[PDB]
Amino acid sequence: MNESQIMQETIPFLHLRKKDEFGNW
Amino acid sequence: VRTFSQQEMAFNLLGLMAPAIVNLCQSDPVFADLNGGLQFIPDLKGLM
């Protein structure tokens, strides 16, 4: 819900994604 | 969760029309979720 408050290695150049409960890829 | 009357929505909109926000817009585009928090009811169409 609020990532910004709570939190204030590698990703592949080619990746798939999935949708969050809050339609996020 | 909450649904609105038109007069309410107009109010809310006229809100973004107010000088405070208007100046925000002049420096930066404004997002403004005026959804009744339905952002949490998933498969809303199914529920309905």
Distance CA B46, CA B36 (A): 18
Sorted by sequence, the CB contacts under 8 Å of residue B36 that are 6+ apart come out as: B1, B2, B3, B4
> Could you tell me the CA-to-CA distances from B28 to A6, A13, B20, B22, B32 in Å, in that order?
25, 31, 13, 10, 12
Distance of CA B45 to the CA centre of its chain: 20
What Å distances lie between residue A25 and A16, B3, B4, B19, B27, CA to CA? 9, 27, 30, 35, 29
Q: How many other CB atoms are found less than 10 A from the CB of residue B36? A: 13
| Exp. method | X-ray
Q: Contacts for A22-25 with beta carbons within 8 Å, 24 or more apart?
A: A22/B39
Counting every residue, how long is chain A?
Answer: 25
Q: Which residue type occupies B2?
A: R
Q: Where are the beta strands (DSSP E) in B1-48?
A: none
This PDB structure is determined at a resolution in Å of 3.1
Which two three-digit tokens encode residue A9?
A: 């290695």
